[PDB]
Amino acid sequence: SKGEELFTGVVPILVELDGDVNGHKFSVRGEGEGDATNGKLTLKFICTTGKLPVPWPTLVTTLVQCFSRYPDHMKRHDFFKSAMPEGYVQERTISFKDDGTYKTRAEVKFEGDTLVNRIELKGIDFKEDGNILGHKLEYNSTWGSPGWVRLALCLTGLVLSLYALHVKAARARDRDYRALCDVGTAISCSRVFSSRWGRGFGLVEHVLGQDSILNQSNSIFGCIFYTLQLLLGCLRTRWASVLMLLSSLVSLAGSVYLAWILFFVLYDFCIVCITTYAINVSLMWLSFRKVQENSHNVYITADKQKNGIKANFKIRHNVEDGSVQLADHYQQNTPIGDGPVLLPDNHYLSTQSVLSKDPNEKRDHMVLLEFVTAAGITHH
Numbered sequence: 513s514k515g516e517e518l519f520t521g522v523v524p525i526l527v528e529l530d531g532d533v534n535g536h537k538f539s540v541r542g543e544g545e546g547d548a549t550n551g552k553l554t555l556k557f558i559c560t561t562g563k564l565p566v567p568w569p570t571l572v573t574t575l576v577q578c579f580s581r582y583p584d585h586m587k588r589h590d591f592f593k594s595a596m597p598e599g600y601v602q603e604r605t606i607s608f609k610d611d612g613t614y615k616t617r618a619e620v621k622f623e624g625d626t627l628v629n630r631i632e633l634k635g636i637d638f639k640e641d642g643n644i645l646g647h648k649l650e651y652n653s654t655w656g657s658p659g660w661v662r663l664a665l666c667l668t669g670l671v672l673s674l675y676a677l678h679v680k681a682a683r684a685r686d687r688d689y690r691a692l693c694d695v696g697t698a699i700s701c702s703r704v705f706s707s708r709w710g711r712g713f714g715l716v717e718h719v720l721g722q723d724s725i726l727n728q729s730n731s732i733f734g735c736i737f738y739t740l741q742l743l744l745g746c747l748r749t750r751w752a753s754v755l756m757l758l759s760s761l762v763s764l765a766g767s768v769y770l771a772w773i774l775f776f777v778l779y780d781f782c783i784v785c786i787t788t789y790a791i792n793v794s795l796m797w798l799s800f801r802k803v804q805e806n807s808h809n810v811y812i813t814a815d816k817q818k819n820g821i822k823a824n825f826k827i828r829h830n831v832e833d834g835s836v837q838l839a840d841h842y843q844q845n846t847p848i849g850d851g852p853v854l855l856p857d858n859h860y861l862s863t864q865s866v867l868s869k870d871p872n873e874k875r876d877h878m879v880l881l882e883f884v885t886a887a888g889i890t891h892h
């Protein structure tokens with residue numbers, strides 16, 4: 513498109529936002545530059561009116577997708593640049609799960625040589641004690657609380673594993689030892705932990721032999737697994753999530769095997785064992801949700817009725833208590849001008865945002881670096 517010529521260099525950016533969230537009025541001004549050749553944005557935003565009444569992370573998506581890097585084989589699908597310099601109107605509804613909603617209307621267009629994004633934001637139905645108005649979101653932390661749920665699951669698993677280790681040793685030292693989980697008759701955790709399936713899962717010896725250092729009491733692996741699940745729950749990185757997921761998958765396989773041993777080999781309804789299986793299913797589901805979460809591609813489709821595009825996507829904001837706050841985004845873009853625009857095939861934008869602080873800035877502010885690449889259409 514002709515608009516493309518406006519983005520091959522470095523372009524100055526002005527962002528102006530007037531907002532009202534549950535009657536708390538505020539204004540933001542941002543300035544910086546966009547480098548669409550590298551899909552890169554660098555901006556600093558200031559709350560001009562005082563303290564921002566919502567967390568800065570919740571405004572990132574509202575505060576110029578014309579600066580996305582569209583690979584060359586996708587140049588025909590870049591609506592945003594094709595609508596320039598005349599610009600486009602961008603409207604969103606952002607639904608914060610179990611909380612309020614933002615509605616935004618922005619005009620994005622060139623004024624002289626500056627790409628200007630002017631935005632009106634209305635927020636309603638937010639909870640004063642919630643994560644948004646209550647300022648409970650992490651700004652950019654790389655480590656934090658694991659959350660009450662993960663903590664309960666992992667400490668319970670760890671405590672049970674430690675007790676199983678203790679039980680195995682005590683029963684090895686006294687045939688008449690009775691554990692708290694020795695309920696009687698057909699329920700003896702002592703017998704379970706003392707069986708060959710209680711060491712190396714009854715499998716290690718058959719691959720690594722019985723001498724191996726990996727042929728440890730199951731509860732040792734349990735201690736390690738629950739401790740690492742909790743510690744990885746303190747990390748805010750993709751790789752910690754993938755590790756949690758893979759280890760949960762292993763724990764799933766092992767739990768099903770051990771349950772089979774319980775019911776068809778040992779004939780023992782081991783309540784503490786079943787409890788660890790339930791904890792393992794819980795952690796499996798948590799790591800599954802985690803891996804899903806925060807991928808956050810912006811899914812774009814053409815809206816021929818408005819000569820524009822629509823998009824939808826999910827943002828996950830880390831909460832200081834270790835939980836996550838979903839922000840479900842619905843988006844529409846319509847050209848301001850009457851000249852031709854590109855209507856794309858289905859695709860998505862992959863976005864990475866880095867939030868930081870200006871050590872010399874005393875006003876409430878956010879420094880933002882952003883990298884966005886178009887994808888979702890195979891180059892073949």
Ligand SMILES: O=c1oc2ccccc2c(O)c1[C@@H]1C[C@H](c2ccc(-c3ccc(Br)cc3)cc2)Cc2ccccc21
Nearest residue numbers: 672673676709710730731733734737759762763770785
């Ligand atoms: O101890 C046991 O003896 C048995 C002998 C016969 C039949 C059943 C069992 C039994 O049900 C287990 C489970 C094994 C569990 C555990 C949980 C997770 C992992 C683990 C997960 C992922 C990765 Br990666 C590595 C290890 C290992 C063990 C730890 C544990 C702790 C207390 C009580 C029971 C158990």
